[PDB]
Design a protein around this ligand. Structure first.
Ligand code: Y01
Ligand code: Y01
Ligand code: CA
Ligand code: ZN
Ligand code: ZN
Lengths: 66, 367, 152, 37, 184, 143
């Protein structure tokens, strides 16, 4: 169904998309791309501390059952 | 929608597994690989990327180790190539311990021996390879200048091929040139880009600076012979040149400077750098001070005199050159003889001779 | 030129001199082409008026060469074009061709100067001078001047 | 460059997944311990 | 600026692909000297929001992400759109810089696609169109100079230039001056 | 020059003047060398034709110096080379040497102008002028 020209254009354009994403990875990082990782760290901190608090309250109710 | 498809759109479970593999959800990928039994590990992203390629591209080492244990997992050669390109040393080590590389001799055999068998080992999709088909793991590591990866691959026996001469008549070069003649030249440029890198130069050979000088002249000639790719060969030759310059730049005492400049005091490497026009090597302060100490051999104080005092001694040589030659013939070995054999005094004698010649030319036109 | 590179003051100067000479050789070739063009043109134009001109400027090949070359430095007068007869058309064409020659000379000279300035702006003077001076030094390291070295 | 930072972002993401799964393991173990009580 | 146009502006390849999967397409603005009722009403209403909207739609069309993911032959589309924007730059002089930048985007997209070829078949597919060098003719006609001056196109043209002069391809300039004189 | 640096308009100008003079002194030295070369050459060539020339341009040392120096500004005519006799070889060599002299003068002048432009492009005019003007000021502070 596809002809050799279509196959070759498909190959070349997939290669171009991958190469362009790689070249985008070669751009200098900007302040926003780092604020994103800071927010990553912040949300992770919140989730982990809430998990620890869950563990503590469960141990408290287990003591109460004892 | 898009008038090109690079990957029916899998399954909900396959999409979830690809999400877990790309974003490093280790527990989910382990659970699925253990007990899914309907999922296939070779399911494909929208870009033509299976789970192993996604895990390697995002540096998920634990997900990579989990996937490598799954039998009949595909795209392992390209996984190694991608990990080498990104410089993920630990993922490269994990991939190299796979039976695909441990049992076989994939890394030792040449690019042409890999290419003769179809075998689709470094293919990442239905049709094609991520980098050039001639770019082997060692060549790619040299390109990216991954020093540790280059060392690892060298430990395994991988070596860059040293392409044949340009005007070559052997059957292999003849068939390569008649077949494509553009893939051939691009492959030559790739192999030279691998050879001319500082990582491979430093880690591969016994005397990297001699190799770098010779290869720099080699690429400089290649640039003239093959003019369409003149810029590429010129850049590679410059890489070699400044590798030699950087190696010279690190010397900290006179013994190392001698080892760099005298080769194994005949300044063989300085002669080679002037012959091959490695100008930054010769003009570097270390080579410069060595040449300068040789220049003022026995003229200890004269090394520091002002230019006026050296003009004075130039004039004095111009005046006493008859007496100086007479004394050189009479007393060949003395204080006078030792001073007369110093290179700077030889040069000032030549300059004074030429100035006497011009003065004779002028004074002949007197009256 | 064998002696100047040893001087830190005069070395870089002489290096830039070699550079600019190597560069402007090409514009000299192109100017030779255009100058030969105009020379042959004006020679064919004026050759028949050997004894009908103010001077003998464009009568022969060599004298046309002399006149047109000395026109580069403005050392040639404009009365060389004038005729003694009343052939106004020929002398008007002479005026036009000589003026166009001078204008084209100015155009070529400006382009050369500036292709050169561009080659300069994209550029190591220290490195080049030190390479040349190191060659000069190494020429003397191998174990009397030519005038006195006749005696064996 | 942007890729060297995306690598650290993926580091953080995988670390988050592992830690949350560890906390869930702890919770389910406490649940089975309650059941044994 | 619709979601697809914004994704094309930012060159978010995955987002552009997602939106294309959903049926979103950039509009291909009408001709500059257009007389239809919609263009007439848009031009009479504001005539500055109209031109800015045209520039936005062309900024979306001229992006490498949309060019690569949207059409069947992205290099032909990019050449034609580059000439289109080059003419737009002359027609609409107040926004000359914007159209010029977009046309340059298209040009270097074509150049980057040519830059990726690894064997002669792909080079032929890029240069010969679907050996009449149709795309090379188009690049010279539209003045995509980096495309024609690229080493791949250059070596193709050079192999065509020395068709039967196998050894003469490598001779010094003196030998070619010799053969010039011999022909004379 | 003792007064101009005080003016904000004229200070930087005079600073650049001192700079370009200090620079072109070196090319003046080189031009002295090449000019002396050509002078001695043409003097030795033409000295024997004291009363066989159109004018006395290249007959003596001082007059050869005058002619060749004034040739720098195009103020010297080209008839100075012509001889009265039929020694075509000598006058042809004179034409060749004088033309080569003018061409070499143009070459040296272009190189000087441009070594200078390069020295300029890699460069503080405010700082230099203010340093000079501060020296000028401090010269007057002592009672
Ligand atoms: C003023 C008249 C009477 C004589 C002019 C002579 C110059 C045209 C020539 C002849 C001798 C030459 C000099 C002979 C020796 C030297 C030392 C030489 O080396 C140095 O600068 C000192 C440091 C070193 O030698 O490494 C630099 C060139 C120089 C000045 C030469 C520069 C050109 C000079 C001055
Ligand atoms: C027009 C003819 C008749 C007289 C030309 C005189 C100029 C050649 C000289 C003589 C007096 C000089 C001026 C005397 C005083 C000053 C003020 C001096 O300082 C200032 O610019 C004002 C601010 C400050 O002094 O700090 C700058 C130089 C200037 C204009 C001198 C510039 C050069 C001048 C004009
Ligand atoms: Ca990681
Ligand atoms: Zn061979
Ligand atoms: Zn319309």
């Amino acid at each position: 169904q596809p002809t050799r020209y279509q196959q070759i254009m498909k190959r070349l354009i997939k290669r171009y998309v991958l190469k362009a994403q790689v070249d985008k990875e070669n751009d200098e990082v900007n302040e926003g791309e780092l604020k994103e990782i800071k927010q990553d760290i912040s949300s992770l901190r919140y989730e982990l501390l809430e998990d620890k608090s869950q563990a503590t309250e469960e141990l408290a109710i287990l003591i109460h059952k004892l | 929608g898009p008038a090109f498809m690079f990957n029916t759109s899998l399954t909900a479970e396959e999409e979830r597994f690809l999400d877990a593999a790309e974003y490093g959800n280790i527990p989910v990928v382990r659970k699925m690989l253990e007990e899914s039994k309907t999922l296939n590990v070779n399911c494909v992203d929208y870009m033509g990327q299976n789970a192993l390629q996604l895990a390697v591209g995002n540096e998920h080492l634990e997900v990579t180790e989990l996937l490598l244990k799954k039998e009949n997992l595909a795209r392992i050669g390209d996984a190694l190539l991608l990990a080498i390109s990104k410089g993920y040393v630990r993922i490269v080590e994990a991939i190299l311990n796979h039976p695909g590389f441990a049992a076989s001799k994939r890394l030792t055999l040449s690019p042409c021996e890999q290419e003769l068998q179809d075998d689709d080992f470094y293919a990442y999709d239905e049709d094609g390879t991520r980098f050039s088909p001639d770019i082997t793991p060692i060549i790619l590591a040299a390109h990216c200048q991954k020093y540790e990866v280059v060392h690892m691959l060298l430990m395994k026996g991988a070596r860059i091929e040293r392409p044949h001469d340009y005007f070559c008549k052997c059957g292999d070069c003849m068939e390569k040139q008649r077949h494509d003649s553009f893939s051939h030249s691009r492959s030559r440029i790739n192999a030279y880009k691998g050879l001319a890198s500082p990582a491979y130069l430093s880690l591969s050979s016994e005397d990297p600076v001699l190799t770098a000088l010779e290869l720099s002249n080699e690429l400089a000639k290649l640039a003239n012979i093959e003019k369409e790719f003149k810029n590429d060969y010129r850049k590679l030759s410059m890489q070699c040149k400044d590798f030699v310059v950087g190696v010279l730049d690190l010397c900290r005492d006179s013994e190392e400077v001698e080892a760099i400049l005298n080769g194994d005091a005949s300044l063989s490497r300085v002669k080679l750098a002037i012959k091959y026009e490695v100008k930054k090597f010769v003009a570097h302060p270390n080579c410069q001070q060595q040449l300068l100490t040789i220049w003022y051999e026995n003229l200890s104080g004269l090394r520091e005199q002002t230019i006026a005092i050296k003009c004075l001694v130039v004039l004095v040589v111009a005046l006493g050159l008859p007496f100086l030659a007479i004394g050189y013939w009479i007393a060949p070995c003395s204080r006078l003889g030792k001073i007369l054999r110093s290179p700077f005094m030889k040069f000032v004698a030549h300059a004074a001779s030429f100035i006497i010649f011009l003065g004779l030319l002028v004074f002949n036109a007197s009256d | 030129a064998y002696i100047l590179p040893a001087n830190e003051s005069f070395g870089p100067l002489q290096i830039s001199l070699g550079r600019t000479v190597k560069d402007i050789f090409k514009f000299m070739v192109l100017f030779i082409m255009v100058f030969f063009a105009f020379m042959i043109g004006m020679f064919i134009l004026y050759s028949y008026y050997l004894g009908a001109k103010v001077n003998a400027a464009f009568t022969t090949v060599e004298e046309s060469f002399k006149t047109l070359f000395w026109s580069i430095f403005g050392l040639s007068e404009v009365t060389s074009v004038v005729l003694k007869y009343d052939h106004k058309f020929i002398e008007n064409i002479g005026y036009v061709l000589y003026g166009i020659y001078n204008v084209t000379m100015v155009v070529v000279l400006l382009n050369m100067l500036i292709a050169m300035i561009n080659s300069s702006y994209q550029e190591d003077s220290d490195v080049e001078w030190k390479f040349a001076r190191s060659k000069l030094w190494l020429s003397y390291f191998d174990d009397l001047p030519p005038p006195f070295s006749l005696v064996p």
